[PDB]
Design a binder for these strands. Structure first.
Ligand SMILES: [Mg+2]
Ligand SMILES: [Mg+2]
Ligand SMILES: [Mg+2]
Ligand SMILES: [Mg+2]
Ligand SMILES: [Mg+2]
Ligand SMILES: [Mg+2]
Ligand SMILES: [Mg+2]
Ligand SMILES: [Mg+2]
Ligand SMILES: [Mg+2]
Ligand SMILES: [Mg+2]
Ligand SMILES: [Mg+2]
Ligand SMILES: [Mg+2]
Ligand SMILES: [Mg+2]
Ligand SMILES: [Mg+2]
Ligand SMILES: [Mg+2]
Ligand SMILES: [Mg+2]
Ligand SMILES: [Mg+2]
Ligand SMILES: [Mg+2]
Ligand SMILES: [Mg+2]
Ligand SMILES: [Mg+2]
Ligand SMILES: [Mg+2]
Ligand SMILES: [Mg+2]
Ligand SMILES: [Mg+2]
Ligand SMILES: [Mg+2]
Ligand SMILES: [Mg+2]
Ligand SMILES: [Mg+2]
Ligand SMILES: [Mg+2]
Ligand SMILES: [Mg+2]
Ligand SMILES: [Mg+2]
Ligand SMILES: [Mg+2]
Ligand SMILES: [Mg+2]
Ligand SMILES: [Mg+2]
Ligand SMILES: [Mg+2]
Ligand SMILES: [Mg+2]
Ligand SMILES: [Mg+2]
Ligand SMILES: [Mg+2]
Ligand SMILES: [Mg+2]
Ligand SMILES: [Mg+2]
Ligand SMILES: [Mg+2]
Ligand SMILES: [Mg+2]
Ligand SMILES: [Mg+2]
Ligand SMILES: [Mg+2]
Ligand SMILES: [Mg+2]
Ligand SMILES: [Mg+2]
Ligand SMILES: [Mg+2]
Ligand SMILES: [Mg+2]
Ligand SMILES: [Mg+2]
Ligand SMILES: [Mg+2]
Ligand SMILES: [Mg+2]
Ligand SMILES: [Mg+2]
Ligand SMILES: [Mg+2]
Ligand SMILES: [Mg+2]
Ligand SMILES: [Mg+2]
Lengths: 129, 87
RNA sequence: GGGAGAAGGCACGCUGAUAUGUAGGUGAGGUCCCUCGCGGAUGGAGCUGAAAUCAGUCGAAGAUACCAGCUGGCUGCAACUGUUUAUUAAAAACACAGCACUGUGCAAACACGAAAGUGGACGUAUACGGUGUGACGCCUGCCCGGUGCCGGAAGGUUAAU
RNA sequence: UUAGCUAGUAGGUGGGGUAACGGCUCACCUAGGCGACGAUCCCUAGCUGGUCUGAGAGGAUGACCAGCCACACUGGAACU
RNA sequence: GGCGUAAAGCGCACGCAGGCGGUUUGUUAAGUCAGAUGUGAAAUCCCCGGGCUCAACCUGGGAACUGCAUCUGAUACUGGCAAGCUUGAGUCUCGUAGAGGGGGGUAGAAUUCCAGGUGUAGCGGUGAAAUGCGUAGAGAUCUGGAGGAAUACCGGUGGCGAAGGCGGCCCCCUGGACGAAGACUGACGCUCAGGUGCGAAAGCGUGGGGAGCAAACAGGAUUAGAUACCCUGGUAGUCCACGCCGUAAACGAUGUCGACUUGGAGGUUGUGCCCUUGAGGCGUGGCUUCCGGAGCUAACGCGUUAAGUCGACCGCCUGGGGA
RNA sequence: GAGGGCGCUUACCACUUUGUGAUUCAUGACUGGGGUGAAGUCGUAACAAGGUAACCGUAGGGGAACCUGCGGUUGGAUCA
């Protein structure tokens, strides 16, 4: 069924960008709030917004540049069938520095560049290229 | 099943005698229909298209009763004794 | 299911200990009830009594005598248990459960009897007679020219009258 | 194209034995333990640090060198 | 890495173990991460260096020795544990649609057989003929039976079922789906190795039936021959009840579940509203066939029912033969 | 006298012996099929509507390709 809510979120972002949507929507959660917060920080979405009292809908407003999409590629890393926990020297560096990789560390959720500047690994949720 | 029989079932197993959705109620409705339908599958033996519906009812009763056994052990033991299932 | 007791091998006497006769069986007392007697419970005396283990010892040989499987391999024929040539032949012959064909609608067919009758049967086509084959598995292929048998009565020949 | 295996076998208590725990070895009892996370069975093999290759993950392999194990014609047994 | 067509999705479903698991809080801190400690023998490999005139070689220091264990932390994810939610999954209320299944009745049309009437010399057959049926009176024809099987028109890429499949009408038993407003339980979920159940036709066993049709078989032709097509017959079988077999180009050559992504054309089955103001119009569901966009693809083509973008679990392939 | 030694004896155990399986290799008249071969013989089943559309399953038959029955598939051709 809904065996991966994070891949539901990422697949919704990828589909909406490749099909030229503007305001995509998904059911909310705490990890989805944290990942969308990372994306709004680094600049792969315009702004996110979680609306709803008991069960909310998280809304993502996608960015564009000269018509083309902003997120070139986006994928899972640590899928639930096979999880990928990485130490600090064996951290990734996606797109030779250009893209970002979202890592959940002990200090919340943060981009892998901040994870290297804080000196700890974690779990790699996605490779926003 | 008939409306008087299901009203009897929810009255004899119900939480507030209205809810009709509790786990004891669903197992009671399933077991009532299974022990009613064994008589159908004793006289008609080649009735496979309803034998599959009986197997669905059996598996669903077993899923609910295993969830009851995980949830409350005392309620599961008293319910299987009150109905008359074997295990 | 069988093969199979397959084959093949080990122990086997007497004495002592466990146990001065064991486990088990039988149950006298005695005690209590007792719907009171050929009644019922603990109660186990006495009586009987395997079987096993350890030790010792004897003999050349311990199931010591009498009684008491020769075993295995390949194959023919017949499925088997049965039956027969009393008195030279016990089988590969006969039967057999099973298979099929055929007859028979009951006052059955069929047999024994000139005939009555009776068996069939005090049974009624899932029954009965007759024929061939002889469990079970795989199967039963072609021919209706011959001789039978069954269906035809249009025609040829055809008896008594 | 090996699914069953195991009678000192899994455990207990007592005795004995060993430098030392332990079925190591016996008496008695319990009837267990191992098994689809591959027991049992068959075939091959000394293992490792390494070496060769590979961008790397790996693949092959164990010469010299070094550590450990086993054996000393074959099969045993004990002594000092 | 791959599965529509190149080799590859079990025939289809149920389901134990196993794998994965929505969302909120609190705790624990097992997995995860981070520091330290012990350790990873030396040799080798590598980085700086020294020597043999150079190199090979010898050698000093260093990290590495991707590990293991211990202590100490952190709490985002995953796990355990405890409490909650309601969207996932399910239950009730009321209908709709349906060749869904099982059992028993019954109806007519037609074919064949029989029996009887008429009436006379042909019928049947193909490319053309013949075997066959006919002067014992057929074929045609009217009446009365008997029998078995399949259900014309409806009928439509229509419906239902998980797959095979299911087709006149009626009753009895019965499963499933879907829709509406409510209510309720509150993760009860998904997939599933082994395991089980269903599984067309042909085939087998036992016992019935046996009209048509018809492998085998016979006869007639065509042919060079024709063990075939075509013709005349015709037994298994088809059929009914019990079983057994477990296979198909079991096909959408497309495993199940779930999410997201431009449209059009119809069909089907509900349902809300609006004045059904006449056989309307505005929406929401489910199911279903055709065209097609970006995307994809080796191309063909698939295209909101994906072969698009993804996730969970399972099955399977590693050149053609041999097989 | 204790205690010792030799000797006898019992326990354990190797070589050896019998019986009987399990596996594996070699060999074996003859045979089931498979593959390769020089202008061999008999056909002509498939590819076009391959001249009877092929094919799948199953059964029967037949010198052999294959034929026919029953069910299924389009991966079959013609549409004025
Ligand atoms: Mg249900
Ligand atoms: Mg002979
Ligand atoms: Mg005999
Ligand atoms: Mg005899
Ligand atoms: Mg006699
Ligand atoms: Mg004689
Ligand atoms: Mg005699
Ligand atoms: Mg004699
Ligand atoms: Mg008489
Ligand atoms: Mg005979
Ligand atoms: Mg004979
Ligand atoms: Mg004969
Ligand atoms: Mg004759
Ligand atoms: Mg004749
Ligand atoms: Mg004949
Ligand atoms: Mg005659
Ligand atoms: Mg001890
Ligand atoms: Mg001791
Ligand atoms: Mg490589
Ligand atoms: Mg040694
Ligand atoms: Mg030696
Ligand atoms: Mg490939
Ligand atoms: Mg092909
Ligand atoms: Mg293929
Ligand atoms: Mg399929
Ligand atoms: Mg399933
Ligand atoms: Mg979770
Ligand atoms: Mg921890
Ligand atoms: Mg070292
Ligand atoms: Mg130098
Ligand atoms: Mg936690
Ligand atoms: Mg609610
Ligand atoms: Mg609640
Ligand atoms: Mg299976
Ligand atoms: Mg059949
Ligand atoms: Mg039959
Ligand atoms: Mg046959
Ligand atoms: Mg028959
Ligand atoms: Mg007939
Ligand atoms: Mg198959
Ligand atoms: Mg089909
Ligand atoms: Mg199809
Ligand atoms: Mg297939
Ligand atoms: Mg792809
Ligand atoms: Mg299309
Ligand atoms: Mg897909
Ligand atoms: Mg493809
Ligand atoms: Mg041809
Ligand atoms: Mg031809
Ligand atoms: Mg052809
Ligand atoms: Mg042909
Ligand atoms: Mg063709
Ligand atoms: Mg033929």
């Amino acid at each position: 069924s809904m065996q991966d809510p994070i891949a539901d979120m990422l697949t919704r972002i990828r589909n909406g960008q490749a099909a030229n949507k503007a305001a995509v929507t998904m059911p909310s959660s705490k990890l989805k709030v944290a990942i969308a917060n990372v994306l709004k920080e680094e600049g792969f979405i315009e702004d996110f917004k979680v609306e709803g009292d008991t069960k909310p809908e998280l809304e993502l407003t996608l960015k564009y540049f000269q018509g083309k999409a902003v997120v070139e590629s986006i994928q899972r890393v640590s899928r639930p069938g096979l999880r990928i926990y990485k130490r600090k020297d064996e951290l990734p560096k996606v797109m030779a520095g250009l893209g970002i990789a979202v890592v959940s560390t002990s200090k919340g959720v943060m981009t892998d560049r901040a994870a290297r500047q804080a000196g700890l690994g974690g779990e790699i949720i996605c490779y926003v290229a | 099943l008939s409306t008087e029989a299901t009203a009897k079932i929810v009255s004899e197993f119900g939480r507030d005698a209205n809810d009709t959705g509790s786990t004891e109620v669903q197992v009671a409705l399933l077991t009532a229909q299974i022990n009613h339908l064994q008589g159908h599958f004793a006289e008609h033996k080649k009735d496979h298209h309803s034998r599959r519906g009986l197997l669905r009812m059996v598996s669903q009763r077993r899923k609910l009763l295993d969830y009851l056994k995980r949830k409350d052990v005392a309620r599961y033991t008293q319910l299987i004794e009150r109905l008359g299932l074997r295990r």
